[PDB]
Write an enzyme that holds these catalytic residues in place. Sequence first.
Site, PDB file in Angstrom:
ATOM      1  N   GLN A   1       5.704   4.628   1.830  1.00  0.00           N
ATOM      2  CA  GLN A   1       4.885   3.396   1.064  1.00  0.00           C
ATOM      3  C   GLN A   1       5.180   2.023   2.174  1.00  0.00           C
ATOM      4  O   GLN A   1       6.281   1.787   2.765  1.00  0.00           O
ATOM      5  CB  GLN A   1       5.419   3.092  -0.062  1.00  0.00           C
ATOM      6  CG  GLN A   1       5.048   4.153  -1.471  1.00  0.00           C
ATOM      7  CD  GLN A   1       6.044   4.103  -2.623  1.00  0.00           C
ATOM      8  OE1 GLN A   1       6.930   3.919  -2.648  1.00  0.00           O
ATOM      9  NE2 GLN A   1       5.091   3.757  -3.571  1.00  0.00           N
ATOM     10  N   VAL A   2       4.029   1.376   1.849  1.00  0.00           N
ATOM     11  CA  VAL A   2       4.348   0.014   2.665  1.00  0.00           C
ATOM     12  C   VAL A   2       4.246  -1.322   1.950  1.00  0.00           C
ATOM     13  O   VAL A   2       3.677  -1.456   0.678  1.00  0.00           O
ATOM     14  CB  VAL A   2       2.863  -0.241   3.369  1.00  0.00           C
ATOM     15  CG1 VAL A   2       2.981  -1.232   4.668  1.00  0.00           C
ATOM     16  CG2 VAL A   2       2.340   1.228   4.186  1.00  0.00           C
TER      17      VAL A   2
ATOM     18  N   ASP B   1      -8.413   8.070  14.165  1.00  0.00           N
ATOM     19  CA  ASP B   1      -8.855   7.724  12.747  1.00  0.00           C
ATOM     20  C   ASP B   1      -9.217   5.887  12.635  1.00  0.00           C
ATOM     21  O   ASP B   1      -8.322   5.343  12.884  1.00  0.00           O
ATOM     22  CB  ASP B   1      -7.685   7.926  11.652  1.00  0.00           C
ATOM     23  CG  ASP B   1      -8.403   7.870  10.234  1.00  0.00           C
ATOM     24  OD1 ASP B   1      -9.722   7.741  10.263  1.00  0.00           O
ATOM     25  OD2 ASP B   1      -7.524   8.045   9.267  1.00  0.00           O
TER      26      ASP B   1
ATOM     27  N   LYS C   1       6.756  -0.385   6.752  1.00  0.00           N
ATOM     28  CA  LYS C   1       6.202   0.728   6.462  1.00  0.00           C
ATOM     29  C   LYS C   1       7.550   1.555   6.483  1.00  0.00           C
ATOM     30  O   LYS C   1       8.226   1.758   7.535  1.00  0.00           O
ATOM     31  CB  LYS C   1       5.408   1.072   7.894  1.00  0.00           C
ATOM     32  CG  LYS C   1       3.959   1.606   7.261  1.00  0.00           C
ATOM     33  CD  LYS C   1       3.008   1.099   8.344  1.00  0.00           C
ATOM     34  CE  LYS C   1       1.528   2.041   7.946  1.00  0.00           C
ATOM     35  NZ  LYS C   1       0.401   1.675   9.094  1.00  0.00           N
TER      36      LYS C   1
ATOM     37  N   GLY D   1       0.775  -1.252  -0.040  1.00  0.00           N
ATOM     38  CA  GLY D   1       0.117  -0.123   0.057  1.00  0.00           C
ATOM     39  C   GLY D   1       0.775   1.288   0.249  1.00  0.00           C
ATOM     40  O   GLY D   1       1.914   1.051   0.140  1.00  0.00           O
TER      41      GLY D   1
HETATM   42  C1  LIG Z   1      -2.160   1.603   4.622  1.00  0.00           C
HETATM   43  C2  LIG Z   1      -1.875   0.675   3.733  1.00  0.00           C
HETATM   44  C3  LIG Z   1      -2.778  -0.548   3.757  1.00  0.00           C
HETATM   45  C4  LIG Z   1      -4.206  -0.454   3.357  1.00  0.00           C
HETATM   46  O1  LIG Z   1      -4.755  -1.692   3.357  1.00  0.00           O
HETATM   47  N1  LIG Z   1      -2.573  -1.008   5.256  1.00  0.00           N
HETATM   48  C5  LIG Z   1      -2.126  -2.201   5.682  1.00  0.00           C
HETATM   49  N2  LIG Z   1      -2.715  -3.347   5.049  1.00  0.00           N
HETATM   50  C6  LIG Z   1      -2.049  -4.534   5.224  1.00  0.00           C
HETATM   51  N3  LIG Z   1      -2.627  -5.798   4.239  1.00  0.00           N
HETATM   52  C7  LIG Z   1      -3.850  -5.361   3.476  1.00  0.00           C
HETATM   53  C8  LIG Z   1      -3.602  -5.510   2.107  1.00  0.00           C
HETATM   54  C9  LIG Z   1      -2.838  -6.458   1.518  1.00  0.00           C
HETATM   55  C10 LIG Z   1      -2.592  -6.379   0.096  1.00  0.00           C
HETATM   56  C11 LIG Z   1      -2.563  -5.106  -0.456  1.00  0.00           C
HETATM   57  C12 LIG Z   1      -2.182  -5.032  -2.060  1.00  0.00           C
HETATM   58  C13 LIG Z   1      -1.800  -6.293  -2.304  1.00  0.00           C
HETATM   59  C14 LIG Z   1      -1.800  -7.518  -2.042  1.00  0.00           C
HETATM   60  C15 LIG Z   1      -1.442  -8.725  -2.886  1.00  0.00           C
HETATM   61  C16 LIG Z   1      -2.339  -7.608  -0.541  1.00  0.00           C
HETATM   62  C17 LIG Z   1      -1.216  -4.657   6.211  1.00  0.00           C
HETATM   63  N4  LIG Z   1      -0.607  -5.974   6.810  1.00  0.00           N
HETATM   64  C18 LIG Z   1       0.104  -5.375   7.645  1.00  0.00           C
HETATM   65  N5  LIG Z   1       0.139  -4.049   7.941  1.00  0.00           N
HETATM   66  C19 LIG Z   1       0.637  -3.115   9.032  1.00  0.00           C
HETATM   67  C20 LIG Z   1       1.546  -2.545   8.394  1.00  0.00           C
HETATM   68  C21 LIG Z   1      -0.376  -2.291   9.657  1.00  0.00           C
HETATM   69  C22 LIG Z   1      -0.962  -3.612   6.997  1.00  0.00           C
HETATM   70  N6  LIG Z   1      -0.991  -2.331   6.740  1.00  0.00           N
END
Ligand SMILES: CC[C@H](CO)Nc1nc(NCCCc2cccc(C)c2)c2ncn(C(C)C)c2n1
EC number: 2.7.11.22
Lengths: 826, 248, 313
Positions: C26-27, C145, C42, C20
């Site tokens: 970016q994550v 939030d 992150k 993300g």
């Molecule tokens: C703010 C950014 C995103 C918004 O959802 N947040 C988010 N999402 C996660 N996983 C869900 C989406 C997994 C995914 C996305 C895109 C492509 C594919 C193949 C898979 C996640 N896992 C752990 N964390 C921690 C860092 C808090 C996470 N933080």
Amino acid sequence: MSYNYVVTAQKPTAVNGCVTGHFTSAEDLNLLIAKNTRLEIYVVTAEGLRPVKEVGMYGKIAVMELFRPKGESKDLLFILTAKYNACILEYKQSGESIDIITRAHGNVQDRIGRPSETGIIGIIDPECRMIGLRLYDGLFKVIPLDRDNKELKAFNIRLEELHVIDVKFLYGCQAPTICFVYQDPQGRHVKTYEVSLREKEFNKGPWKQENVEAEASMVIAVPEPFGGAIIIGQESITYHNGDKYLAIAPPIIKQSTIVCHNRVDPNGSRYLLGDMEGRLFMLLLEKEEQMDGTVTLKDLRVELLGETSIAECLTYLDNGVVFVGSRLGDSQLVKLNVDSNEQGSYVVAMETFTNLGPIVDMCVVDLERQGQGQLVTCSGAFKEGSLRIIRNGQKLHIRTVPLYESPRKICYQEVSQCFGVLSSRIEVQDTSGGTTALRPSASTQALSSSVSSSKLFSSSTAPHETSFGEEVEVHNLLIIDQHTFEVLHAHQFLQNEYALSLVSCKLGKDPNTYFIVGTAMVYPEEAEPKQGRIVVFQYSDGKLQTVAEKEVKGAVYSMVEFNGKLLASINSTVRLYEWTTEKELRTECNHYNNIMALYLKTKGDFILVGDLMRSVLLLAYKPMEGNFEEIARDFNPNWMSAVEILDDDNFLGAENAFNLFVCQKDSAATTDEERQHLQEVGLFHLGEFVNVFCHGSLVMQNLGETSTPTQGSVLFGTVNGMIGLVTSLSESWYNLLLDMQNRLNKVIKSVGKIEHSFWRSFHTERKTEPATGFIDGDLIESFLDISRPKMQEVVANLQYDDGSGMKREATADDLIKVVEELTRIH
Amino acid sequence: TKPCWYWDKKDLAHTPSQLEGLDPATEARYRREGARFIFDVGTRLGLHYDTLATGIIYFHRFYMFHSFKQFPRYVTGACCLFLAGKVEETPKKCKDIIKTARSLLNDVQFGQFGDDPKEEVMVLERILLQTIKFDLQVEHPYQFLLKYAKQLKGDKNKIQKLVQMAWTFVNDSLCTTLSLQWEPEIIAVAVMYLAGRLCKFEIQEWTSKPMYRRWWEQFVQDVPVDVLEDICHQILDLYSQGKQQMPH
Amino acid sequence: TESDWGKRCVDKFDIIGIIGEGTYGQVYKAKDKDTGELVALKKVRLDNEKEGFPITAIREIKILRQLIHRSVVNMKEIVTDKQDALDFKKDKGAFYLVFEYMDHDLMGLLESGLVHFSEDHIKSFMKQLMEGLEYCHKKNFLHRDIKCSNILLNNSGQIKLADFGLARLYNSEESRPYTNKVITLWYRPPELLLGEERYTPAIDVWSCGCILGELFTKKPIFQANLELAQLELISRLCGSPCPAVWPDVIRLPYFNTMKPKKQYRRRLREEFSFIPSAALDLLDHMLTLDPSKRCTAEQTLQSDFLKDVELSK
Ligand SMILES: CC[C@H](CO)Nc1nc(NCCCc2cccc(C)c2)c2ncn(C(C)C)c2n1
């Protein structure tokens, strides 16, 4: 920003519904046929159906019913769209001029509601006092049919029964009464309520609850001579009216689920029933005279009449002529005879109405070297499945190749002057322990045949029990000649192996042209397939030879040839294989950031990945390093149905919500973060389910290029049979056509008074966005059909940009020329 | 899981500063000067008392991992206060901290900031964050002085005298290595213990256990009088050496 | 040791892809080379250095190292880009905050249309979320939030709350200056819409209530683009803010400024009549206009709806 143009090449071909009544005149018998977004009005004659009028609506047609309120000379038409646009329509003919009058209209969407499992249901009172709508679980919406309700205002009555299966307004009640089958944890039950317009609530209904078959599906309202309702299930048919209860459970119907019903006789003595294997039954109501002079229901009988096309809707029309409306096959007109023929059938087919059906896959191929190109589609399902050769003439010339089994994927192999087609046929567990096919089909009528003997998954030691009567899919690779479409060879894959992907290509330094198939081992127990094969075949001298097999740990949903290498997606993984000098597949590199890698497309060293959620991802192969690199992903979550690459920067996608969208590299390059954000620059509600995107055009290139404003050509197929075309525009051409749409929407009168801008707005249950970056070419091409006064009205006060004349005032004729060139792309 | 931030007095003779030839008195002087600098700078900027302490605690912790001869102290102090503001939600722009530091430091002292004061400070944040091992949360004797005082009941004016006298002792202990030797809870008790001895107040009577002579044990388990006395001795040395006397 | 954060190199993770676009960076999704554990990195970019290390990240590091609950996302460590030796100033490399990888986010599950929630699933979901909110609120930390994007869900059914950036401590006895504009418009409490800068821990309950209704319809309840349009939708359902139900509405800055079209009556129960009563009572209490009368997290767990849920099942 990006600019694109979308037109229909073939209109929807599948009948979504059909009703008959007295709509065009109080005297004529009319058959109204509803294809998605299209309404066809016919007039029943002894010779056949006479077409009279066809209109489009800016909405998917969900409800279509004919009602005649007291005071009206002829039937009126109610339609509710899937976006909840409701309207009442009237046919009015002033001599030669035919128009559809919008008598009442409005949108009945609720701010808060849960859409129901069994979809929108719309029914009308026998006395035409009110319209019933079941849009959300736990709610029943009433539009009262009073003369003043020109906006179709309505109220909701709380409904205790949350999971409703089907509802009908019952005939013969002192008050308006609804009969519904509902599901709760104790099974399914039939219950009645009375509807009070004065109190705006339910009152206790005429007859008690009865708990019914677990798979009770449809409620049939029975005419006043008998009254009550009949409930059709998987094994039994039951009649409920107050105290009276009847139940017939003939074994013949257990074989195939019954899906549609219609009333033959207004008295209700004869009813028509159809099932998913295409059989047509007669449901007979035997009546017993009473001492009072009253008539009571004695018994029910079911008689098999014959076989039809698998029908979504049936209408009895006149005499023995019945219209068969099919979404999985060709729609038909059939005759019911009193005497059976020598085969025992009472049904004789009269006419066959073409349906491109579900277009599961398709390819464009220049069969005759004309340069034009032809479209071969995987169309239909089950026995109605067929291949369709579609080529331009203005009217499309379509040859039909029946396969009698479900076609899955098609690809052309010129070296072998033949097509490869994946197919699946239904067999049933039989007393032998094996399976038996219901009907002969392509995979069984091949000239020469073979079966996989692979030992990859023979290890077993894990069980899968079989019960007699259970259906299974048997998957095959069909070799079909390109001129005769004779099935030259059929290869049957392993037990429980599904064929999901197919390609024809050469690999590496290997000069042989191969058919390559990607499969998945599908066991009912598994949520996601965990075993799979990539199989390399060679078609040579009338026989298919297995060349090489590669075991994978998942389902090979999609494959594509990639610069001599094989690019395959196994579940989440996207893998690149090399084809060695030992004729075996060797893995080069992998990409794993995916939920499910459903779709793949390539251009050069770039790859576009389509995902079950998270939409599309732009990968790149980096030959210097021998691996993949993520270029950019569309973070907005979407459920993809098909993807395509438009050019090195623009990418096209199709959603499961019937929406089309376009993503572009952010081409800012200030930060790495911007590069990796594919920005949705195009949003468009198509209204069809797109299964396959395919580059090409059916227009005849005279071999000499003549310029068209549109550049590029992507064809797409849909579930309802629509074949459309997407192309790109220059900014100027877009603005001209966009500006003109806004002018055309003010001038053109819509059926139901549905705002065009609303119709094309991107729409999911959760979002609604205005369309962007897309020209509704079907609106543009309508300029050529509006009267001269309206043509000049549309073109008033117009200029232009990026031209020899920097700003160009248009004449109506000037635009007539521009549109006519746009009609030449298809 | 979490790091240990407490050393023994004996261990302080082996700070990098000591081993680069700095004598114990000098490191102590540098420590008080850096602390009073953080204290004075943040006070001019209107900062909450916790933010000052948090900065001071980071500063004291920093020079357990680094030498005063290689990392200038007033630059370090300014950086500590800068991060402390963001941690404790009393943030300040770096330029404002520099502005105040220049107002309070002479020309020689401000030389530590070099040609670009802001850059030299902002650059240290990476090092500071790694040195404190990213354990940003810090507790201070203040909150316990109040949590414990709230459970003392009796003469309103006598208890208030104790709290203010002790609060003064907390502010003064920030100039010492006590922040590195004993958890804050013990400090709060130690300052109460000292104020009580100076005011001739017998804190036991105000407790819910008025015959429990060891009143602290209901607040802080397992603290020997030895520890409280050692702390008292260290706080008093600062008052004896300076011209300043016990507040009373 | 395990506690010496900031020194381990990101070399130890194989980057799998970009999950993300984040606030402070970016994550990315990644696999630990030594254990094979999937993680989520992150990125914290201080190369801008406008004010150095971002505060949004500082909040998530300060708070998530203190909070340990099943339903709170775990920060595992902090690792850095290769640090050049002997030039402590020259290094501009970025730090990465290592979290556990959660399979899906609720918003994505909902936007793609891929999920179906039965009553029992909504119970298991809300019980975990609100138990986590209780842990955080009892520790006096407010997750200002709360949206669908920030609720992460594993296939196991475990729910974990995330993106604790934009989160600050709340003194129970007194109030200080607060940011006010602190939740996404769809999930914002009415008090913040009217401009309250002393937000209660109840700001989060309103969001979790918005979610509770969303889980029963698959659509967000209050969808608007502008703060006024939002107050109008809330009022159509919950009733217009007025002293009759919210005595202190008049002390809020914009009460006179922001009136809805009408003084609506509360219809929450009517428009949600399809919801089970155990749930409807929970929704009605969570979506109470007055921050002082709006239920707490602990009270939601002691509800007929969430009290008797066994999280073992
Ligand atoms: C703010 C950014 C995103 C918004 O959802 N947040 C988010 N999402 C996660 N996983 C869900 C989406 C997994 C995914 C996305 C895109 C492509 C594919 C193949 C898979 C996640 N896992 C752990 N964390 C921690 C860092 C808090 C996470 N933080």
